[PDB]
Amino acid sequence: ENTQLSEAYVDRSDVCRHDHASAYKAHTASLKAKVRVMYGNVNQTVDV
Amino acid sequence: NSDMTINTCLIEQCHVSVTDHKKWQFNSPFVPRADEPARKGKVHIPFPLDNIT
Ligand SMILES: *[C@@H]1O[C@H](CO)[C@@H](O)[C@H](O)[C@H]1NC(C)=O
Ligand SMILES: *[C@@H]1O[C@H](CO)[C@@H](O)[C@H](O)[C@H]1NC(C)=O
């Protein structure tokens, strides 16, 4: 006349913030170039 | 902390167990629990993860 009570469950890892995988949904993308313009005496590159 | 004596009995008919609660120990799954509600504690462990090259 003796009973054992067994118990277990699942937890997120200790380093889940340090290595994990993210699932995303990707929508319309935005082009963003870096162009160099030259004429006369000007020599500049602009992020646009 | 006292030696105890009973008279007309054999060693087979007695069950004796030590009691000591001056120190905690780890919540191991190979040792049994004391109380069902299972009040417990916590202890920070060394050697955390870190970045190197
Ligand atoms: C200025 O324009 C010349 C081309 O005439 C280019 O070789 C040079 O890299 C430009 N200056 C800088 C700082 O990039
Ligand atoms: C390593 O550095 C990155 C930042 O680029 C940080 O997100 C990460 O948590 C760091 N890892 C550890 C174990 O500290």
Side-chain angles (χ1 to χ4, degrees), chain A residues 2-46:
Chain A
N2 305 298
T3 47
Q4 181 185 313
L5 181 63
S6 284
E7 178 185 329
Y9 60 100
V10 167
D11 214 348
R12 166 207 277 123
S13 185
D14 274 12
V15 302
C16 196
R17 54 190 160 108
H18 298 325
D19 68 75
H20 57 270
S22 307
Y24 286 111
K25 303 202 94 58
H27 325 294
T28 69
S30 89
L31 192 42
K32 180 166 171 48
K34 200 195 308 301
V35 180
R36 158 195 315 289
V37 183
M38 284 162 51
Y39 64 95
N41 291 258
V42 72
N43 212 13
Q44 306 213 342
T45 175
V46 293

